[PDB]
RNA sequence: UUUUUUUUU
């Protein structure tokens, strides 16, 4: 930063001047002096860590320093030019005065063309950061190939001398550079996706955006989420995403995986709270108007709204529940402040999803998912001690417990029991039940409350004399030998790194057995070489097994 | 004019005196021996003097 | 009106009023019609330098004189604060103010010429009620009454209004009815010429010079006399330049003595060395004070040319009636020859030839003339050589090559004989003493080896007495005049200057003539060889590039600036052009090509090719070797009286030449060039002073104009814009001409220097400066911590 | 509102 402040100086000064509506090879020698230095500034500390030998203390090793360059060359160039851009089509598009729209045609005419160079330029910068990264060293070790395709990898040839073939294991952490160039991708690949969904915002002019239109940034955003778990910055970007587009499950689903990740994203947590808590927020007004709207439409329109209602009014029951103050009326507790009433809002759920489960039961685990991460965060929300057994949980703990627990029962009773046996391609139906009894296991105090609940028990105790019953293999049976699998599931990768499992899915006992045996790394994120892949029915045993296994484990002291 | 008349006839003579061919421009094209050369007509006239 | 009262407005006020010491004159220092004051206006209009202030001004009746050194000239004085308060040091420009003292702080000195104006301190401003009553004079009348007082000294406004007839010099033609109407034509702009060429060299006289007496190799008496240094730079001599050394005193008597300089001031030493031709009557080797020097004008060379056209105008077997119409541009139909196409174009052992230079030698050997335009770096010498060799094969007689530039002449005669052809260098008589690198070629040498016989025995002794009898120099003459008519027979080719070909030992008329970068010669120079009984005239040369320098401004106005080459271009020749360079990086090439060639230019060399590895020079962009340094110093006036020099720039300068210096660049690869010449000796001296490291380190590098370094190339090449002045006036490099042939000097990398702002309005440099931007190459500050400059480059409209 | 170079019996 001491050899970088002029230039953000510099920077602030050229948009104070405003030359850049006259002169854009200012902005764009501006930008190949910048490119340049930052490119010599990241080959020289990539080439000054690389000089250090093994027997160096760990210490000495200046990690973040990659990462400082790069979060300062978005925030503090391309954002900031950005933000410049954005402005000035804020400016042109809503001058309130009566002039003639032609001329601003022709000023958006001006905008596409200078900021698809803008654009072009960065994503060169990238690109080229990724490709010189690629060049001059060896990734394939470390990262997925199907991440090195997707980057086009591939068809950049490799002039590293055999000499230069750095001896790197797949997660040897003794070696410092097995996790600079991981942050280097997944930043890139964060700043890349961001560029995109700029873009996108710039291209259109009017401010209706579809889902459609952020498909290539969306992708990006996957496969930076990839390249680095631990990261919940990336998941708020997503977050972002899906919030302007209105689809807002997904997006506190994002915010939530965001902050109680190993590395907490402020930002998720602002979002969130600004959704949740700041009642003046004008996002919550806007889940307000849609959630009220959606009343109205049940009500109203010709026919009954699955999809929203299952994701919207259960948003209403999360509020309802998880912040007692804000939602239900002071004078009327058991009602909505739209006046919605809790109780006809939780049983059109109930129909709602029994009814139509298979059709939207991504958004039904999502609700799962921030209904298992809300006690954590409401815990967390204490500003008083922690609390450590049952006696210390408060009445507004112990009312979501129950509310939780409910769902829970209910959706276990009325969807895995009749979908498990005839929907075998669906994963996620046993999923869900793995992820709850992993959840369960991982917290003890939620374990403890669930023997008191008669509700979750029976239920629980229904399933397994289900499963039993139908026999659905020969073998199958209650033992106490763990399962063990060759790879990990799309629910250990979607539910990866979070700490109410303690960061990894441990109802299966093979994480060592996968990595010492070959393209672990590849296997971790449910992508083995297709030998491996065995057919969904076997998934679906294992997951049987599995879960029947741990629900025993769960009811012997029930 | 007498120059355009020595002009005229000096390119009729040459045109006579050669052999025709065509060019890979198309302009007519005639090719003549290196040793055999033609003197354009002076006549008479007044000199500038110093 | 009193005598203290102004020539030029009569403003009595003493407050005004300054004495040129020169010729006793009062001079104002207002502006009134006029872009100056006229104080200075005379000053360089009449060459004068030392001014005397008036009595009762202020400062008194003194005669403005440096403090250190005591020199005179106006032009070098400027006032420098002292420490103590109120106290004013009369400093000139160099070395006074560039040596440091601790008496008063020299960074703050100012030139005494400011805005083309003295300081008011030393000459107030008239007050208005003077200014009104003053007469006001336009700079028309300004020139034309200071025309006349280099004639009589009391002509004022009034006195002259002569109608001295300016006869309208017909502009030239480019077809003329007949060669009677072109040498008509041709004419008085010739004679306007020659009798100004005289005029300024013969007022040249050296007096009272110190010359010392030493003997050279070929015992020949030595004069070599110092000079001083404004006069040894303003002295326009050559190598082998005949003078007059005369002295006229009661020590000795009268005597004259005649001979050739072989050494000229340079870099090292400042010593003109006259090698006196053997005389009857020795030199007073026993004088060293009050010699005079008077250059012998020559008339040769313009008298030649009039013999050209009087041959033209003249001789029907002069010019063969083809090339004789095309000169006077008459339509012909086109003609071919019969000669047979060789099976292979490029000759082994030797450079091997592209697809351009295979189509340049095919469509040469088939017509009688054609012209080659070649951009710098391609090597248009190769072609050449091919041309005549080839040539000479198919025909089997004399050629002839000629160009001006006698050291072109010296390198194309070193090629074609290393072709294996016999090459005879006609030398310059002044010219037969000065060495070169195909001295082994010169006729002169040629009749000296191979003499026989008496011949042996006639040169030893006029080598060893220096002079002969009549019957004895008749025999002589005689003889070594077979030898040479003998050696020419028998000589494949002939080497001469373009001047050269006048001379009557070329008696025997040629047929075969190349004539080389004729461009850089004027039509009457290029017309000199052409009418020596030619059929096949082929003309190379490059239009792009600088051409003739006319001294005559009327014949420069009329057209004396336009070539053969460009007439014949203008007729409706289109020329053969070669696309590929060899010498610049591609980055550097960028901007020429696209400018003056229409981008159709390509490049022979890769990026890598020019490009030197682990560079540490902080270029503002890596791998670009080239930025724009801006600096927002003032211009001045060097010691010349009308040239420009900043020091800014050359502190700059010197400190880029420090910079590249420790990146490991031997100074044989970096050179300087200025396109003022009194910028180029400010940079001289001011590099040999304050060298940071070793003063060697920096004198061994070479520093000439932009005129003077065309046609050489090096690794790196410093421009300096120098003009920087409030009115945006740049002067004489509006032209794209100078700009191109500038940038083209560099091969690896290229610096530019100057103030961004005065070239804005220039339309070339405007797109110089738009190319140098877009591609991330403007900057400002120091050259360690160069960030970008903002200048408003595009004018808002 | 122009200052530079080529040539020379």
Redesign the pocket.
Same mark, same amino acid.
Request: with cysteine.
């Given at each position: 930063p001491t050899a970088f402040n002029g230039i953000k100086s510099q920077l602030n000064s050229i948009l104070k001047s405003n030359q850049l509506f006259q002169d854009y090879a200012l902005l764009n020698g501006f930008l190949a002096f910048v490119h340049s230095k930052l490119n010599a500034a990241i080959l020289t500390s990539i080439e000054s860590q690389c000089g250090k030998s093994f027997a160096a203390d760990l210490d000495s090793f200046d990690q973040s320093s990659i990462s400082s360059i790069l979060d300062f060359s978005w925030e503090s160039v391309h954002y900031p030019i950005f933000k410049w851009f954005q402005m000035w089509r804020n400016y042109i598009l809503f001058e309130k005065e009566n002039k003639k729209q032609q001329t601003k045609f022709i000023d958006f005419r001006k905008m596409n063309s200078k900021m698809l160079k803008f654009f072009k330029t960065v994503q060169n910068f990238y690109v080229n950061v990724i490709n010189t990264v690629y060049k001059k060293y060896d990734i394939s070790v470390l990262l997925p190939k199907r991440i090195i395709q997707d980057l086009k990898l591939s068809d950049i040839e490799n002039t590293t001398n055999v000499g230069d073939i750095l001896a790197v294991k797949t997660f040897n952490s003794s070696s410092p550079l097995a996790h600079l160039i991981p942050t280097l991708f997944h930043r890139c690949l964060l700043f890349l996706g961001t560029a995109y969904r700029y873009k996108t915002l710039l291209e259109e002019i009017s401010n209706k955006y579809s889902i459609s239109n952020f498909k290539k940034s969306l992708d990006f955003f996957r496969l930076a989420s990839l390249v680095l778990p631990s990261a919940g910055e990336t998941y708020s970007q997503a977050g972002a995403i899906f919030l302007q587009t209105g689809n807002l499950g997904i997006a506190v689903f994002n915010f939530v995986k965001g902050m109680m990740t190993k590395m907490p994203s402020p930002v998720s947590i602002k979002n969130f709270g600004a959704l949740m808590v700041d009642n003046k927020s004008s996002l919550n007004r806007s889940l307000h108007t849609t959630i009220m709207n959606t009343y109205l439409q049940e009500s109203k329109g010709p026919r009954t709204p699955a999809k929203e209602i299952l994701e919207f009014y259960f948003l209403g029951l999360f509020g309802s529940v998880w912040s007692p103050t804000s939602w239900r009326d002071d004078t009327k507790p058991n009602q909505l402040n739209n006046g919605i009433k809790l109780r006809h809002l939780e049983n059109a759920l109930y129909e709602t999803m029994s009814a139509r489960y298979l059709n939207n039961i991504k958004t039904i685990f999502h609700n799962l998912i921030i209904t298992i991460g809300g006690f954590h965060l409401l815990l967390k929300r204490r500003s008083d001690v922690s609390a450590k057994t049952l006696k210390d949980l408060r009445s507004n703990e112990l009312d979501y417990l129950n509310f939780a627990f409910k769902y829970i029962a209910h959706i276990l009773n009325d969807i895995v029991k009749e979908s498990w046996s005839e929907n075998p391609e669906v994963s996620e139906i046993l999923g869900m039940v793995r992820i709850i009894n992993c959840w369960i296991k991982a917290n003890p105090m939620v374990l403890q409350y669930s023997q008191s609940n008669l509700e979750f028990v029976n239920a629980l105790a229904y399933l397994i004399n289900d499963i039993v019953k139908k026999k659905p293999s020969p073998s199958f049976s209650i033992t106490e030998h763990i399962p063990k699998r060759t790879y990990w599931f799309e629910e250990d990768l979607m539910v990866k790194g979070l700490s109410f499992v303690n960061f990894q899915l441990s109802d299966f006992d093979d994480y060592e057995k996968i990595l010492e045996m070959d393209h672990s790394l590849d296997r971790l994120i449910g992508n083995p070489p297709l030998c491996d892949k065995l057919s969904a029915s076997s998934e679906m045993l294992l997951r049987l097994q599995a879960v029947v296994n741990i629900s025993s484990q769960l009811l012997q002291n029930n | 004019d007498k120059s355009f008349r020595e002009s005229e006839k000096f390119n009729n003579m040459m045109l006579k005196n050669g052999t025709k061919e065509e060019s890979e421009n198309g302009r007519e094209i005639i090719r003549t021996n290196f040793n055999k050369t033609v003197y354009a007509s002076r006549g008479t006239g007044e000199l500038w003097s110093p | 009106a009193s005598d203290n009262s102004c020539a030029y407005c009569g403003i009595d006020s003493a407050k005004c009023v300054i004495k040129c010491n020169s010729c006793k004159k009062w001079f104002c220092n207002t502006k009134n019609g006029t #872009?100056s004051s006229h104080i200075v206006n005379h000053l360089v209009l009449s060459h004068h330098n030392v001014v005397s202030l008036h009595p009762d001004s202020d400062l008194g009746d003194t005669v403005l004189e440096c403090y250190n050194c005591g020199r005179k000239n106006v032009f070098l004085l400027g006032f420098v604060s002292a420490k103590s308060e109120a106290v004013v040091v009369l400093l000139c420009r160099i070395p006074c103010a560039q040596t440091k003292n601790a008496n008063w702080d020299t960074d703050q000195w100012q030139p005494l010429i400011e805005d083309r104006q003295l300081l008011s301190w030393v000459a107030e401003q008239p007050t208005e009620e003077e200014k009104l009553k003053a007469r006001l004079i336009t =700079? #028309?009348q300004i $020139?034309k009454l200071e025309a006349k007082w280099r004639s009589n000294k009391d002509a004022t406004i009034n006195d002259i209004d002569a109608p001295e007839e300016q006869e309208a010099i017909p502009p030239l033609l480019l077809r003329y009815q007949d060669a009677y109407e072109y040498q008509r034509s041709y004419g008085p702009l010739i004679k306007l010429e020659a009798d100004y060429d005289k005029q300024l060299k013969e007022s040249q006289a050296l007096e009272h010079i110190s010359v010392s007496w030493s003997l050279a190799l070929n015992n020949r008496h030595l004069a070599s006399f110092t000079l001083s240094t404004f006069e040894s730079n303003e002295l /326009?001599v050559?190598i082998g330049? !005949?003078m007059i050394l005369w002295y006229s005193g009661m020590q000795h008597p009268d005597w004259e003595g005649r001979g050739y300089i072989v050494r000229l001031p340079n870099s090292f030493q400042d010593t003109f060395t006259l090698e006196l031709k053997p005389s009857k009557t020795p030199p007073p080797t026993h004088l060293t004070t009050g010699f005079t020097a008077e250059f012998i004008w /020559?008339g040769? $060379?313009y008298d030649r040319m009039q013999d050209a056209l009087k041959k033209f105008a003249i001789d029907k077997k002069s010019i063969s009636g083809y090339l004789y119409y095309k000169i006077l541009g008459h339509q012909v139909v086109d003609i071919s020859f019969d000669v047979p196409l060789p099976k292979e174009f490029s000759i082994p052992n030797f450079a091997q030839l592209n697809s351009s230079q295979s189509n340049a030698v095919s469509h040469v050997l088939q017509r009688p003339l054609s012209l080659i335009q070649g951009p710098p770096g391609t090597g248009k010498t190769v072609t050449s050589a091919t041309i005549v060799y080839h040539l000479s094969k198919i025909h089997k007689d004399r050629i002839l090559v000629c160009a =001006?530039?006698? +050291?072109a002449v010296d390198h194309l005669a070193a090629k074609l004989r290393d072709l294996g052809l016999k090459v005879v260098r006609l030398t310059? /008589? #002044?010219?037969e003493d000065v060495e070169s690198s195909v001295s082994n070629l010169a006729l002169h040498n040629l009749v000296g080896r191979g003499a026989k016989g008496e011949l042996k025995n006639l040169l030893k002794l006029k080598d060893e007495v220096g002079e002969l009898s009549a019957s004895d120099t008749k025999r002589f003459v005689k003889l070594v005049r077979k030898t040479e008519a003998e050696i020419l027979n028998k000589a494949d080719v002939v080497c001469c *200057?373009c +001047? &050269?070909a006048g001379?009557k030992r070329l008696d025997t008329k040629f047929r075969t003539v190349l004539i080389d970068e004729s461009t850089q010669?004027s039509e009457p120079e290029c017309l000199i060889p052409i009418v020596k009984g030619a059929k096949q005239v082929i003309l190379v040369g490059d239009h792009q590039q600088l051409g =003739? +320098?006319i001294?005559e401004?009327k014949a420069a106005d009329a057209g004396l600036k336009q070539s053969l080459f460009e007439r014949l271009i203008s007729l409706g020749h289109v020329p053969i052009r070669l696309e590929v360079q060899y010498r610049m990086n591609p980055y550097l090439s960028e901007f020429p090509s696209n400018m003056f060639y229409e981008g159709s230019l390509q490049n022979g060399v890769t990026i890598e090719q020019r490009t030197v590895p682990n560079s540490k020079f902080p270029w503002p962009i890596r791998g670009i070797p080239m930025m724009f340094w801006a600096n927002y110093g003032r211009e001045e006036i060097s010691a010349?009286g *009308? #040239?420009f020099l900043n020091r800014i720039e050359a502190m700059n300068c010197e400190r880029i030449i420090t910079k590249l210096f420790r990146d490991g660049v031997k100074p044989e690869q970096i050179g300087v060039i200025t396109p003022? !010449?009194?910028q180029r000796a400010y940079i001289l001296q001011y590099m040999q002073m304050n060298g940071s490291l070793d003063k060697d380190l920096y004198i061994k590098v070479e520093v000439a104009?932009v005129?003077?370094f065309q046609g050489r190339e090096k690794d790196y090449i410093i421009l300096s814009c120098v003009r920087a002045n409030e009115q945006q006036?740049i &002067?004489?490099l509006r032209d794209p001409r100078r700009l191109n042939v500038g940038l083209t000097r560099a091969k690896y990398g290229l610096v530019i220097l100057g103030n961004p702002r005065s070239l804005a309005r220039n339309t070339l440099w405007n797109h110089l400066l738009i190319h140098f931007r877009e591609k991330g190459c403007l900057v400002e500050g120091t050259l360690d911590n160069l960030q970008l400059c903002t200048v408003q480059l595009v004018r808002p409209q």
């Amino acid at each position: 930063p001491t050899a970088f402040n002029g230039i953000k100086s510099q920077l602030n000064s050229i948009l104070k001047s405003n030359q850049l509506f006259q002169d854009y090879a200012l902005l764009n020698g501006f930008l190949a002096f910048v490119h340049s230095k930052l490119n010599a500034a990241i080959l020289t500390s990539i080439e000054s860590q690389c000089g250090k030998s093994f027997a160096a203390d760990l210490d000495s090793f200046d990690q973040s320093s990659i990462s400082s360059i790069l979060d300062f060359s978005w925030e503090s160039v391309h954002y900031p030019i950005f933000k410049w851009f954005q402005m000035w089509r804020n400016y042109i598009l809503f001058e309130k005065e009566n002039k003639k729209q032609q001329t601003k045609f022709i000023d958006f005419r001006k905008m596409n063309s200078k900021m698809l160079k803008f654009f072009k330029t960065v994503q060169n910068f990238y690109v080229n950061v990724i490709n010189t990264v690629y060049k001059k060293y060896d990734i394939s070790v470390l990262l997925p190939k199907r991440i090195i395709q997707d980057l086009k990898l591939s068809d950049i040839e490799n002039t590293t001398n055999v000499g230069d073939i750095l001896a790197v294991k797949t997660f040897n952490s003794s070696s410092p550079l097995a996790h600079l160039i991981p942050t280097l991708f997944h930043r890139c690949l964060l700043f890349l996706g961001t560029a995109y969904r700029y873009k996108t915002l710039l291209e259109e002019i009017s401010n209706k955006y579809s889902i459609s239109n952020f498909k290539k940034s969306l992708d990006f955003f996957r496969l930076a989420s990839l390249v680095l778990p631990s990261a919940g910055e990336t998941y708020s970007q997503a977050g972002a995403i899906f919030l302007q587009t209105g689809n807002l499950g997904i997006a506190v689903f994002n915010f939530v995986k965001g902050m109680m990740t190993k590395m907490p994203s402020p930002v998720s947590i602002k979002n969130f709270g600004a959704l949740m808590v700041d009642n003046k927020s004008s996002l919550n007004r806007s889940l307000h108007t849609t959630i009220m709207n959606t009343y109205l439409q049940e009500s109203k329109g010709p026919r009954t709204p699955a999809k929203e209602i299952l994701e919207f009014y259960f948003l209403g029951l999360f509020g309802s529940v998880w912040s007692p103050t804000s939602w239900r009326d002071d004078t009327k507790p058991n009602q909505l402040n739209n006046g919605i009433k809790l109780r006809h809002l939780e049983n059109a759920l109930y129909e709602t999803m029994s009814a139509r489960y298979l059709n939207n039961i991504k958004t039904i685990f999502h609700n799962l998912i921030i209904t298992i991460g809300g006690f954590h965060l409401l815990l967390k929300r204490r500003s008083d001690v922690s609390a450590k057994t049952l006696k210390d949980l408060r009445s507004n703990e112990l009312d979501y417990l129950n509310f939780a627990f409910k769902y829970i029962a209910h959706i276990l009773n009325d969807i895995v029991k009749e979908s498990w046996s005839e929907n075998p391609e669906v994963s996620e139906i046993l999923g869900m039940v793995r992820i709850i009894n992993c959840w369960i296991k991982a917290n003890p105090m939620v374990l403890q409350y669930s023997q008191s609940n008669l509700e979750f028990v029976n239920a629980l105790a229904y399933l397994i004399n289900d499963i039993v019953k139908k026999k659905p293999s020969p073998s199958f049976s209650i033992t106490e030998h763990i399962p063990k699998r060759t790879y990990w599931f799309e629910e250990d990768l979607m539910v990866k790194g979070l700490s109410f499992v303690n960061f990894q899915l441990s109802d299966f006992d093979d994480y060592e057995k996968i990595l010492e045996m070959d393209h672990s790394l590849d296997r971790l994120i449910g992508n083995p070489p297709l030998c491996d892949k065995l057919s969904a029915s076997s998934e679906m045993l294992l997951r049987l097994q599995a879960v029947v296994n741990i629900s025993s484990q769960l009811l012997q002291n029930n | 004019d007498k120059s355009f008349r020595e002009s005229e006839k000096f390119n009729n003579m040459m045109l006579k005196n050669g052999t025709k061919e065509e060019s890979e421009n198309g302009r007519e094209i005639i090719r003549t021996n290196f040793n055999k050369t033609v003197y354009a007509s002076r006549g008479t006239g007044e000199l500038w003097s110093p | 009106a009193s005598d203290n009262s102004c020539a030029y407005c009569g403003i009595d006020s003493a407050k005004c009023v300054i004495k040129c010491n020169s010729c006793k004159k009062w001079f104002c220092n207002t502006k009134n019609g006029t #872009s100056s004051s006229h104080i200075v206006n005379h000053l360089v209009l009449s060459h004068h330098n030392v001014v005397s202030l008036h009595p009762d001004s202020d400062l008194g009746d003194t005669v403005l004189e440096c403090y250190n050194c005591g020199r005179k000239n106006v032009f070098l004085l400027g006032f420098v604060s002292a420490k103590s308060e109120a106290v004013v040091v009369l400093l000139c420009r160099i070395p006074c103010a560039q040596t440091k003292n601790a008496n008063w702080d020299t960074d703050q000195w100012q030139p005494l010429i400011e805005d083309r104006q003295l300081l008011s301190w030393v000459a107030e401003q008239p007050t208005e009620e003077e200014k009104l009553k003053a007469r006001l004079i336009t =700079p #028309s009348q300004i $020139s034309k009454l200071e025309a006349k007082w280099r004639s009589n000294k009391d002509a004022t406004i009034n006195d002259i209004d002569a109608p001295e007839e300016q006869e309208a010099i017909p502009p030239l033609l480019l077809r003329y009815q007949d060669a009677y109407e072109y040498q008509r034509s041709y004419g008085p702009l010739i004679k306007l010429e020659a009798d100004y060429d005289k005029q300024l060299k013969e007022s040249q006289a050296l007096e009272h010079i110190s010359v010392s007496w030493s003997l050279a190799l070929n015992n020949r008496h030595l004069a070599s006399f110092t000079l001083s240094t404004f006069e040894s730079n303003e002295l /326009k001599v050559a190598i082998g330049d !005949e003078m007059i050394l005369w002295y006229s005193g009661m020590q000795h008597p009268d005597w004259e003595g005649r001979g050739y300089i072989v050494r000229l001031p340079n870099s090292f030493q400042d010593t003109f060395t006259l090698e006196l031709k053997p005389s009857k009557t020795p030199p007073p080797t026993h004088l060293t004070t009050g010699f005079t020097a008077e250059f012998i004008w /020559k008339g040769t $060379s313009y008298d030649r040319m009039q013999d050209a056209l009087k041959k033209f105008a003249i001789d029907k077997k002069s010019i063969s009636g083809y090339l004789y119409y095309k000169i006077l541009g008459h339509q012909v139909v086109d003609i071919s020859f019969d000669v047979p196409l060789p099976k292979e174009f490029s000759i082994p052992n030797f450079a091997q030839l592209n697809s351009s230079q295979s189509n340049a030698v095919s469509h040469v050997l088939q017509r009688p003339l054609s012209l080659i335009q070649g951009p710098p770096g391609t090597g248009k010498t190769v072609t050449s050589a091919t041309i005549v060799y080839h040539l000479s094969k198919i025909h089997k007689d004399r050629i002839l090559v000629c160009a =001006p530039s006698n +050291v072109a002449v010296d390198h194309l005669a070193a090629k074609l004989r290393d072709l294996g052809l016999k090459v005879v260098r006609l030398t310059a /008589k #002044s010219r037969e003493d000065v060495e070169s690198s195909v001295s082994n070629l010169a006729l002169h040498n040629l009749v000296g080896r191979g003499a026989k016989g008496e011949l042996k025995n006639l040169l030893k002794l006029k080598d060893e007495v220096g002079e002969l009898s009549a019957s004895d120099t008749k025999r002589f003459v005689k003889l070594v005049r077979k030898t040479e008519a003998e050696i020419l027979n028998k000589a494949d080719v002939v080497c001469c *200057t373009c +001047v &050269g070909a006048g001379d009557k030992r070329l008696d025997t008329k040629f047929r075969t003539v190349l004539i080389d970068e004729s461009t850089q010669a004027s039509e009457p120079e290029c017309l000199i060889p052409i009418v020596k009984g030619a059929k096949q005239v082929i003309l190379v040369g490059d239009h792009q590039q600088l051409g =003739p +320098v006319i001294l005559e401004r009327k014949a420069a106005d009329a057209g004396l600036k336009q070539s053969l080459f460009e007439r014949l271009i203008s007729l409706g020749h289109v020329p053969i052009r070669l696309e590929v360079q060899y010498r610049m990086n591609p980055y550097l090439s960028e901007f020429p090509s696209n400018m003056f060639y229409e981008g159709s230019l390509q490049n022979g060399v890769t990026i890598e090719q020019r490009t030197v590895p682990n560079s540490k020079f902080p270029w503002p962009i890596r791998g670009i070797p080239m930025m724009f340094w801006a600096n927002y110093g003032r211009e001045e006036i060097s010691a010349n009286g *009308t #040239s420009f020099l900043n020091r800014i720039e050359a502190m700059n300068c010197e400190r880029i030449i420090t910079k590249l210096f420790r990146d490991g660049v031997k100074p044989e690869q970096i050179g300087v060039i200025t396109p003022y !010449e009194g910028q180029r000796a400010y940079i001289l001296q001011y590099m040999q002073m304050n060298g940071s490291l070793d003063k060697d380190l920096y004198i061994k590098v070479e520093v000439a104009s932009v005129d003077a370094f065309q046609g050489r190339e090096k690794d790196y090449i410093i421009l300096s814009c120098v003009r920087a002045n409030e009115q945006q006036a740049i &002067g004489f490099l509006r032209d794209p001409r100078r700009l191109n042939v500038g940038l083209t000097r560099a091969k690896y990398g290229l610096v530019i220097l100057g103030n961004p702002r005065s070239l804005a309005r220039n339309t070339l440099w405007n797109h110089l400066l738009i190319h140098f931007r877009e591609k991330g190459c403007l900057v400002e500050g120091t050259l360690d911590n160069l960030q970008l400059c903002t200048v408003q480059l595009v004018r808002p409209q």
